[PDB]
Write an enzyme that holds these catalytic residues in place. Structure first.
Site, PDB file in Angstrom:
ATOM      1  CB  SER A 102      -0.921  -0.030   1.232  1.00  0.00           C
ATOM      2  OG  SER A 102      -2.168   0.593   0.974  1.00  0.00           O
ATOM      3  CG  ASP A 241      -5.494  -3.713  -3.909  1.00  0.00           C
ATOM      4  OD1 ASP A 241      -4.397  -4.301  -3.821  1.00  0.00           O
ATOM      5  OD2 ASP A 241      -5.853  -2.788  -3.140  1.00  0.00           O
ATOM      6  CG  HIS A 268      -5.306  -2.883   0.222  1.00  0.00           C
ATOM      7  ND1 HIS A 268      -4.585  -2.347  -0.821  1.00  0.00           N
ATOM      8  CD2 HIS A 268      -4.818  -2.313   1.350  1.00  0.00           C
ATOM      9  CE1 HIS A 268      -3.689  -1.500  -0.347  1.00  0.00           C
ATOM     10  NE2 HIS A 268      -3.809  -1.463   0.968  1.00  0.00           N
TER      11      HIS A 268
HETATM   12  O1  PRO Z   1      -2.397   2.381   2.657  1.00  0.00           O
HETATM   13  C1  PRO Z   1      -3.006   3.467   2.527  1.00  0.00           C
HETATM   14  O2  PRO Z   1      -3.553   4.069   3.475  1.00  0.00           O
HETATM   15  C2  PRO Z   1      -3.088   4.102   1.137  1.00  0.00           C
HETATM   16  C3  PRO Z   1      -3.761   5.475   1.181  1.00  0.00           C
HETATM   17  C4  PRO Z   1      -5.206   5.143   0.974  1.00  0.00           C
HETATM   18  C5  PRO Z   1      -5.141   4.136  -0.146  1.00  0.00           C
HETATM   19  N1  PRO Z   1      -3.940   3.356   0.203  1.00  0.00           N
END
Ligand code: PRO
Ligand code: PRO
EC number: 3.4.11.5
Length: 290
Positions: A102, A241, A268
């Site tokens: 992420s 995701d 995700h």
């Molecule tokens: O890991 C996170 O928070 C990022 C920011 C939002 C979408 N993905």
């Protein structure tokens, strides 16, 4: 039982968990998402040790168990200098395989652009090179959600009424659809989330939630630089995701020789939805570029 400890980096204490592999063949440094979460939800990768792969977990600045520096340093650029310092301090000159999940993936990318000479390979899972793009895609995901949840997100989101129960519903629904698709989330994940809500990094750098990026990383975009990456790169992205395959493609398009693996039925937190498969493909990749 891995070894846990405090490392003083850039004037602050950073907690790190080193899970050495018996017949270690290589080391893997990991970067958790958020920003503001924790290494916790990445523990599933520990299975890598049985593959002779040492794995370095650590809570970035202000995250989990580590102490926060000055707010002026709540940036990805600083996060990079933190990763290098830790790398240099914990392993010296020894090159290593960097993995980012992420936000950790976007962070990992920024790291590679500057210190790829200290890396042998890069693994990006649900990562991104452009926040704005990641945002527009998620918006599509939202509009693709049930009317009630979609209108609850727009209605209560435009007001900052994130505490609203209806808004909450729409959020958890979204998560159980694009963050993690499973009945009961593992404790490891719930703690990283618990941390993001406890510390101040997630609130400032990221924002209210996953699909509401109002933090200081709102405009970040290094798509134009990730092209300078030449090392063996592996990119993964769940089929559903939150950081859509389109976001993963833009990356895979800038890094020559990179691989794109879209996990079906996954989202995700693919390392949990498909632990075996995930841990497998990652170890295979590594054992191919020693
Ligand atoms: O890991 C996170 O928070 C990022 C920011 C939002 C979408 N993905
Ligand atoms: O309440 C929420 O949605 C945020 C998202 C990360 C953890 N807490």
């Amino acid at each position: 039982e891995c070894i846990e400890n405090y490392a003083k980096v850039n004037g602050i204490y950073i907690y790190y968990k080193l899970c050495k592999a018996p017949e270690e063949k290589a080391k893997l440094m990991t970067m958790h998402g958020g920003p503001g979460m924790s290494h916790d939800y990445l523990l599933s990768l520990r299975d890598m040790t049985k593959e002779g792969i040492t794995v370095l977990f650590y809570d970035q600045f202000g995250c989990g168990r580590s102490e926060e520096p000055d707010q002026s340093k709540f940036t990805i650029d600083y996060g990079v200098e933190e990763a290098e310092a830790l790398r240099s301090k914990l392993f010296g000159n020894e090159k290593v395989f960097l993995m980012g999940s992420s936000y950790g993936g976007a962070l990992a990318l920024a790291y590679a652009v500057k210190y790829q000479d200290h890396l042998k390979g890069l693994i990006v899972s649900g990562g991104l090179s452009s926040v704005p793009l990641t945002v527009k895609e998620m918006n599509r995901l939202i509009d693709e959600l049930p009317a009630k949840y979609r209108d609850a997100i727009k209605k209560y989101g435009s007001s900052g009424s994130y505490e609203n129960p209806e808004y909450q519903e729409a959020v958890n629904y979204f998560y159980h659809q694009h963050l993690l698709r499973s009945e009961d989330w593992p404790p490891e994940v719930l703690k990283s989330l618990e941390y993001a809500e406890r510390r101040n990094v997630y609130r400032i750098m990221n924002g209210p939630n996953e699909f509401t990026i109002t933090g200081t990383i709102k405009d970040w975009d290094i798509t134009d630089k990730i092209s300078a990456i030449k090392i063996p790169t592996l990119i993964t992205v769940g089929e559903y995701d939150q950081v859509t395959p389109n976001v993963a493609r833009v990356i895979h398009e800038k890094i020559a020789g990179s691989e794109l693996h879209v996990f079906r039925d996954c989202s995700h937190l693919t390392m949990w939805e498909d632990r075996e498969g995930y841990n497998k493909l990652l170890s295979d990749f590594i054992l191919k570029h020693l």
